[PDB]
Amino acid sequence: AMSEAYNWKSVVTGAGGGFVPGIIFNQSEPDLIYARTDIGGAYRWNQATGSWVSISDAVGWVDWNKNGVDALATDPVDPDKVYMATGTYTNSWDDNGQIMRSGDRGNTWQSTPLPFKVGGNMPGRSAGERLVIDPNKNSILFFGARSGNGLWKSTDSGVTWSKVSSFPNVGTYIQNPTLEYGNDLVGLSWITFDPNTGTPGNATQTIYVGVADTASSVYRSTDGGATWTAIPGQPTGYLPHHGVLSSTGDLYITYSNGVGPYDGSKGEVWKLNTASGAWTNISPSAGTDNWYGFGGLAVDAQHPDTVMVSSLNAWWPDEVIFRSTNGGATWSRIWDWGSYPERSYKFAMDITAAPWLNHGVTNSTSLDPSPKLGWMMGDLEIDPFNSNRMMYGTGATIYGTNNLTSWDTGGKVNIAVMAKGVEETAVLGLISPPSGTAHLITALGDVSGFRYEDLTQAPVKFQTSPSWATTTGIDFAELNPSYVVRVGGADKEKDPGMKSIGISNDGGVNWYMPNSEPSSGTKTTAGQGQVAVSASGNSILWSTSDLGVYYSKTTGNSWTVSAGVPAGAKVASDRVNPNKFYAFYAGIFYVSTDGGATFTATAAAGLPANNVGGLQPNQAQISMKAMPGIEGDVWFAGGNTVENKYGLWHSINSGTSFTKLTNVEEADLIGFGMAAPGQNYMALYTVARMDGVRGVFRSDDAGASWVRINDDAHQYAKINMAITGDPRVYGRVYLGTNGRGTLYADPV
Ligand SMILES: [Cl-]
Ligand SMILES: [Cl-]
Ligand SMILES: [Mg+2]
């Protein structure tokens, strides 16, 4: 099981590109901050570099659900210690979560299984804090769980966990109650200690818990969690999102009529004076002036009469942050209406670290700000050692400021991208062109994808004309690589004239939309699917998501149904012969020699069919590519264990027959890069299991032997997304992920 040392690095996006539901400051050590994501693990801040370091890259293929980080706690007594509650909801039986523990700030981890599921991907994932460490006796932790599992506790520093049977209310609210197998209780929403009620080494006695139950949502124990009471006088009707106890004694709570991160059309903010028992409604807006939940909540530890909250979600014209310096008695908004439609602003956005966050819309107007302040602002935090620093997560990035108190003196708060080092995108495709200025073009969920000349530079340009959220396929003409085609999902309710295909003749720098798209009767395709471009660029083959496979030899001025190939097929172009395309579906390989107009099933046998047991079409793992420079040389990776058809196959006769490589016991992806010096065949790059070892492997000898090029510290979870080499850089691999962005790596 030979390995070769490689340097693994992120292809930079600057902003991260996904949802950050939690930012967690340590309450005792200045500049110790963590960030948790829903699909891509967690991070620790580095003040010296102003950037984040992943603490999750050892998570691998089997244990991938550890990157669903539902909660995180950082120990205020021993700040080397950090813990996380991780897992996702799936359909699988026994897909339980775990509590992970680290004694070195997340450099290394140990894990304890829980007997129930954790929902790092589920609604309410930005509520918190749901995992907490007792600030007086740090061997005590509590976890507020989903699905009726209630309140759980450890008294041995997270090693073993047990249910707190006396907790009286496991939750009643369900986001989707009549939904089939989505009948799941949200559960507990947050836990907050009163640190004045313990002493060093002795358990904190007063604990507050918020529960997703609109009729009874706030509980207190005064005996360390032995017994619990619903607090008298509490408000009813809404769902608590955060509860923060200021050192003044005021417990602040944000409420919404949803749990987040999307739903929330009404909300309130309350405080409880914990000494006097009096509750006050301090909501910044009410009635028809409130059309959003309140989500994020922060108290300024250095100035604990200062509190801020965010909308979740106001949507239009933007979100709102509200700031009070008098305990909620009065609030200032971060923007106000002037003479309508104009607005006045207390902030300025700086996206120089990720200029694509303007989405290619350069003019920022009052009713259409670009960039927006944010969205999905479920978590807002003030640095407990610096009242001038705030950070918040959005659905795309982490924003923050270092001049927050300028708000109070009439200056503008400068809000900048504060996500350097974070990469959270899901990668649907990668191409590395063999000439031109770009080494890589990515196809991404949510933020479309980007073109790189320099892999270390945050993209300047968002992909527009067409503009969409998710690129599902991309290809280029091998023998005319300036010609690039991407397909995706245009949002036609927002822009009825947007197309789901974009074409470039300048290498992907600028795009245009063709005059037509595939249609059937009165139905025009919704797009998506996969695309292949002929070697010359004279034909585009689009395996649409909804209408099946179409081709165009007219640059998209018209589209014609392809004969002989089933809807949903995987498609690929020959890299030499412009008339030759390949397709694959359900264990059948197809070839066209008329530019995609007609396909024939070949005699190729033994490829996986994805049609046994319960297997669903979204489960099919298939990676099929033809080799640059050699007509009819086709590699295929994928399959599964239930069919006993999993591995890497090679054809040298245009798919007429395939031979399974006997030295690759499972494989999921294949890609090619520059031949090694002295060798005559392009290097191969695969995601595979080799003799029991899962990883990323390179072959310099056409698959006769393989060397592992990742390692146990650089695994990136379920890496079944995309891989390619670089035709101009020997040894370089580009690896897609589902939640860690794109990596590039080169031999040491
Ligand atoms: Cl958290
Ligand atoms: Cl949420
Ligand atoms: Mg937080």
mmCIF file with all atom_site columns, N, CA, C and O and ligand atoms in Angstrom, residues 19 123-127 241 259-261, ligand 2:
data_model
loop_
_atom_site.group_PDB
_atom_site.id
_atom_site.type_symbol
_atom_site.label_atom_id
_atom_site.label_alt_id
_atom_site.label_comp_id
_atom_site.label_asym_id
_atom_site.label_entity_id
_atom_site.label_seq_id
_atom_site.pdbx_PDB_ins_code
_atom_site.Cartn_x
_atom_site.Cartn_y
_atom_site.Cartn_z
_atom_site.occupancy
_atom_site.B_iso_or_equiv
_atom_site.pdbx_formal_charge
_atom_site.auth_seq_id
_atom_site.auth_comp_id
_atom_site.auth_asym_id
_atom_site.auth_atom_id
_atom_site.pdbx_PDB_model_num
ATOM   1  N  N  . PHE A 1 19  ? -23.550 27.556 4.266  1.00 0.00 ? 19  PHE A N  1
ATOM   2  C  CA . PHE A 1 19  ? -24.211 28.051 5.468  1.00 0.00 ? 19  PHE A CA 1
ATOM   3  C  C  . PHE A 1 19  ? -23.354 27.807 6.688  1.00 0.00 ? 19  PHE A C  1
ATOM   4  O  O  . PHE A 1 19  ? -22.853 26.696 6.908  1.00 0.00 ? 19  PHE A O  1
ATOM   5  N  N  . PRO A 1 123 ? -33.645 21.292 10.038 1.00 0.00 ? 123 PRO A N  1
ATOM   6  C  CA . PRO A 1 123 ? -34.156 22.589 10.502 1.00 0.00 ? 123 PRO A CA 1
ATOM   7  C  C  . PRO A 1 123 ? -33.794 22.833 11.968 1.00 0.00 ? 123 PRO A C  1
ATOM   8  O  O  . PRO A 1 123 ? -33.774 21.908 12.793 1.00 0.00 ? 123 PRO A O  1
ATOM   9  N  N  . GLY A 1 124 ? -33.523 24.098 12.320 1.00 0.00 ? 124 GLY A N  1
ATOM   10 C  CA . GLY A 1 124 ? -33.169 24.442 13.673 1.00 0.00 ? 124 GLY A CA 1
ATOM   11 C  C  . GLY A 1 124 ? -31.708 24.247 13.957 1.00 0.00 ? 124 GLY A C  1
ATOM   12 O  O  . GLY A 1 124 ? -31.297 24.383 15.097 1.00 0.00 ? 124 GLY A O  1
ATOM   13 N  N  . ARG A 1 125 ? -30.910 23.920 12.952 1.00 0.00 ? 125 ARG A N  1
ATOM   14 C  CA . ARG A 1 125 ? -29.484 23.682 13.183 1.00 0.00 ? 125 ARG A CA 1
ATOM   15 C  C  . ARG A 1 125 ? -28.697 24.934 13.615 1.00 0.00 ? 125 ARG A C  1
ATOM   16 O  O  . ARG A 1 125 ? -27.598 24.807 14.178 1.00 0.00 ? 125 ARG A O  1
ATOM   17 N  N  . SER A 1 126 ? -29.259 26.142 13.435 1.00 0.00 ? 126 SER A N  1
ATOM   18 C  CA . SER A 1 126 ? -28.621 27.349 13.960 1.00 0.00 ? 126 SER A CA 1
ATOM   19 C  C  . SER A 1 126 ? -29.145 27.766 15.333 1.00 0.00 ? 126 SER A C  1
ATOM   20 O  O  . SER A 1 126 ? -28.618 28.738 15.912 1.00 0.00 ? 126 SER A O  1
ATOM   21 N  N  . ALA A 1 127 ? -30.149 27.074 15.874 1.00 0.00 ? 127 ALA A N  1
ATOM   22 C  CA . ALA A 1 127 ? -30.524 27.360 17.264 1.00 0.00 ? 127 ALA A CA 1
ATOM   23 C  C  . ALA A 1 127 ? -29.398 26.901 18.186 1.00 0.00 ? 127 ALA A C  1
ATOM   24 O  O  . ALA A 1 127 ? -28.641 25.963 17.873 1.00 0.00 ? 127 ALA A O  1
ATOM   25 N  N  . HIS A 1 241 ? -35.196 30.558 19.713 1.00 0.00 ? 241 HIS A N  1
ATOM   26 C  CA . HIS A 1 241 ? -34.045 30.219 18.877 1.00 0.00 ? 241 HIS A CA 1
ATOM   27 C  C  . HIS A 1 241 ? -32.732 30.258 19.663 1.00 0.00 ? 241 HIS A C  1
ATOM   28 O  O  . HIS A 1 241 ? -31.874 29.385 19.503 1.00 0.00 ? 241 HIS A O  1
ATOM   29 N  N  . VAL A 1 259 ? -38.443 27.319 13.128 1.00 0.00 ? 259 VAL A N  1
ATOM   30 C  CA . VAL A 1 259 ? -37.151 27.043 13.760 1.00 0.00 ? 259 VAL A CA 1
ATOM   31 C  C  . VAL A 1 259 ? -35.950 27.435 12.920 1.00 0.00 ? 259 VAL A C  1
ATOM   32 O  O  . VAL A 1 259 ? -34.826 27.402 13.439 1.00 0.00 ? 259 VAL A O  1
ATOM   33 N  N  . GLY A 1 260 ? -36.146 27.826 11.668 1.00 0.00 ? 260 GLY A N  1
ATOM   34 C  CA . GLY A 1 260 ? -35.026 28.197 10.836 1.00 0.00 ? 260 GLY A CA 1
ATOM   35 C  C  . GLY A 1 260 ? -34.488 27.000 10.084 1.00 0.00 ? 260 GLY A C  1
ATOM   36 O  O  . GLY A 1 260 ? -34.859 25.847 10.339 1.00 0.00 ? 260 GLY A O  1
ATOM   37 N  N  . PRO A 1 261 ? -33.594 27.258 9.113  1.00 0.00 ? 261 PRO A N  1
ATOM   38 C  CA . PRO A 1 261 ? -33.019 28.570 8.834  1.00 0.00 ? 261 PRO A CA 1
ATOM   39 C  C  . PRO A 1 261 ? -33.742 29.359 7.741  1.00 0.00 ? 261 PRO A C  1
ATOM   40 O  O  . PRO A 1 261 ? -33.377 30.541 7.508  1.00 0.00 ? 261 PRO A O  1
HETATM 41 CL CL . CL  B 2 .   ? -31.757 27.070 11.801 1.00 0.00 ? 2   CL  B CL 1
#
